[PDB]
Design an enzyme around this catalytic site. Structure first.
Site, PDB file in Angstrom:
ATOM      1  N   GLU A 149       0.943  -1.411   0.117  1.00 49.59           N
ATOM      2  CA  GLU A 149       0.498   0.325   0.064  1.00 49.59           C
ATOM      3  C   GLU A 149       0.730   1.972  -0.402  1.00 49.59           C
ATOM      4  OE1 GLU A 149      -3.782  -1.702  -0.081  1.00 49.59           O
ATOM      5  OE2 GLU A 149      -2.867   0.331  -0.127  1.00 49.59           O
ATOM      6  N   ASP A 179      -6.722   6.439  -4.348  1.00 52.62           N
ATOM      7  CA  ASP A 179      -5.748   5.205  -4.621  1.00 52.62           C
ATOM      8  C   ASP A 179      -6.282   4.157  -6.317  1.00 52.62           C
ATOM      9  OD1 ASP A 179      -9.164   3.080  -3.646  1.00 52.62           O
ATOM     10  OD2 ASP A 179      -8.361   4.585  -5.210  1.00 52.62           O
TER      11      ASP A 179
END
Ligand SMILES: [Cl-]
Ligand SMILES: [Cl-]
Length: 162
Positions: free
Chosen positions: A11, A20
């Site tokens: 991540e 994202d």
């Protein structure tokens, strides 16, 4: 390697609100803020999550705290889920990390929908499960990360992360 270091590799860490891979407002270590298009709705959730007026920016410590909650919630969601729990209980320590990673990324409902792969993992048919897991939007959308998780399930080692 452990679940925290694994997810930290998948991540990244960003201290300012960002979008994202799906285009949603996120901050820290993959902490989804909102699916809403509004940056203000994101800043609002952010401040609610941190307990302070952040103006879209947080510290490393704050990022890590969110991360700790999120991993904790991921594990507890697996444990409470009737479809997931039996899978998790059946797995070794490494592969358990792999399932936690999927849940953290796509949520419990999401993973719980991989019915066929789940059954294959439970039966310990590694190679077959890896093949079936790859036939998914997940794999098509984030192929590098998916391959890493898939390799972890196939091998039961952390090689893909080393
Ligand atoms: Cl929160
Ligand atoms: Cl990827």
């Amino acid at each position: 390697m452990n679940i925290f270091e694994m997810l930290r590799i998948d991540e990244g860490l960003r201290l300012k609100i960002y979008k994202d891979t799906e285009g949603y407002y996120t901050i820290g270590i993959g902490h989804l803020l909102t699916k809403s298009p509004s940056l203000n709705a994101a800043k609002s959730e952010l401040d609610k999550a941190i307990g302070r007026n952040t103006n879209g920016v947080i510290t490393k410590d704050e990022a890590e705290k969110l991360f700790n909650q999120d991993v904790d919630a991921a594990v507890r969601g697996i444990l409470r889920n009737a479809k997931l729990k039996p899978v998790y209980d059946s797995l070794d320590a490494v592969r358990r990390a792999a399932l936690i990673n999927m849940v953290f990324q796509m949520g419990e409902d999401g993973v719980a929908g991989f019915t066929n792969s789940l059954r294959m993992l439970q039966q310990k048919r590694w190679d077959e499960a890896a093949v079936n897991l790859a036939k998914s939007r997940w794999y098509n959308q984030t192929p590098n990360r998916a391959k890493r998780v898939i390799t972890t399930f196939r091998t039961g080692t952390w090689d893909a992360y080393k």
